[PDB]
């Protein structure tokens, strides 16, 4: 178990979907602020890209890490169960896709996908309403894996 991980030279990629921006924004912010403030990652070394939806996360990431070199990637998206089976099938495919991209590439990919039953749960996990911002955890994870990959 580590303690004070600093990655001043780590290059971090954050790709986030744009559905449910109320939850996405705090998550990205929390990941960024945690990496900068707690791990000395440099703001200019954090590329933040977006894709329309969670479905595009794996491909978005795959495309970006083929272009630039990153020490770790955080894919962030929020899927909320709806009236059809859409949520179940794409949640599964996206999580599998994210794992696959990480394993195929050798680049640590941190899962920042919330797969919740309703918006309240998503907001709660983004740090609102007394909840804990999971983005912070993902930021620290990215830093740790990025460092271990070096």
């Amino acid at each position: 178990n580590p303690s004070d991980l600093k990655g001043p030279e780590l290059r971090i990629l954050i790709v986030h979907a744009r559905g449910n921006l109320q939850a996405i924004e705090p998550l990205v912010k929390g990941a960024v602020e945690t990496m900068i403030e707690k791990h000395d990652v440099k703001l200019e070394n954090i590329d933040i890209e977006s894709v329309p939806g969670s479905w595009e996360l794996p491909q978005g990431i795959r495309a970006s890490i083929a272009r630039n070199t990153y020490d770790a990637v955080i894919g962030i998206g929020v899927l909320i169960k709806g009236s059809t089976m859409h949520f179940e099938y794409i949640s599964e495919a996206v999580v599998h896709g994210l794992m696959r991209v990480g394993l195929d590439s050798g680049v640590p990919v941190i899962l920042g996908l919330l797969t919740v039953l309703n918006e309240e749960q998503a907001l709660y996990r983004a740090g609102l309403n007394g909840g804990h911002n999971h983005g912070n955890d993902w930021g620290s994870a990215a830093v740790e894996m990025g460092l271990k990959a070096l």
Copy 2:
């Protein structure tokens, strides 16, 4: 600003299944119209191919992107839960197959697969009966991913 994304040079492939044409037609139309009118995609640059069912979607796409060059693909199909477990297993394999074809090829594949409980849900998601045509969203996603693929 998704609306300000223009892809006059994008070559987009739309492969759609032919099951549940009442829902498929508006979805395909929505995607095409959105790409053309909202993203300046050229009608000549949009190839539309069909396959019998959703099952054939990954293979139809895989075959087509091996033949021509596309900046993005939209796989469209409507799967409605039936009396057997057919729906559950093929929905899962098709979604995985679409994701796989995209990742294997590097070509953005937009999921335009409706996995619904009944036809009303499908029609509703095709923009009928007060619903929003999801095909429009897929058209915009394809343009955005196509552009981000080149640049």
Copy 3:
């Protein structure tokens, strides 16, 4: 419907579990291809494997030996008392998709994943049902053709 594939070579691999349902499905696929799409009887290879589990491998092995424009994998899985049905249904469906994608040869899913035998027979065209094998035959012809 006006799709003709007089030069298509089609492979049908079917499992042998639940032959009462398998036979009509295979027959419907073959008849539909011959009668409706002008596929030649001698250009249709039919092979069988013991169960649905072997469908992906039986197909992979066959398309590695001969050249086919399309393949129909036919099997009938009926939900039983254990979780066997769920796990192999998913693995076989995945396997069939994989073999198609890996090989580039269209693989038509002719796998029924039903709750009971009545549903399987119904989908094989018995008891007022529609023979799904016919649809698969047409799908195979269409995909074989589109694979140019």
Copy 4:
């Protein structure tokens, strides 16, 4: 469809887990006896190996078919639903793993995995208490796939 399949020259590999040996033993026995007595496979041409649990089946098989040449493989294991979600996740992963090893290697891999709700169901499928020994079916399947792979 086939009549009387004989594989006197077939080399068959059986890899079996060791969890729930009461059920495993009859399965292996049924497969072996069926291949020998009904398909003329030679006892000395049947290699039997074991791994600790079902999780290790794909890897155990992969390792063995890399070392020796087999016409077919039967992977045998018994997973019984427990109190956690372990059963669901490993059943899926092992079944997928077995299909993968077979497709990857081109060597027929017969699924000899029981995924049951309780031990009674497992013994029943191992031919006890009036049940049919599924191992017999697997032995015949292996011979048939082994022969067709020629």
Copy 5:
């Protein structure tokens, strides 16, 4: 009576739910040393933040060093969302894939439980059996059969 004095074993564990993780890792190690004669110097232990990182942590490590076997240990507890279901499935598949891709035996040491009690129980507490011991023996056995 399986002894692997020359086996090099890697244990990668997540750090979520350390109350359960610690006994698991300890059990796997003690078992390998005491029961299989694996040498303390030949056991590498690395950690990753969460179960999600297990496959990648393992893949990266077996690319760097040579191990005869690997145990990926993590504890996932069902929560209020569907997170548990989706990641358990992806991590288990991830672990199976890393082992098959690399040819290095990967022993699954992931607990996928409904609550903490079940995890602690499978870590040898409150009268339970420490599953880490079993993983330690499986790793040894697979490490050896890989030779």
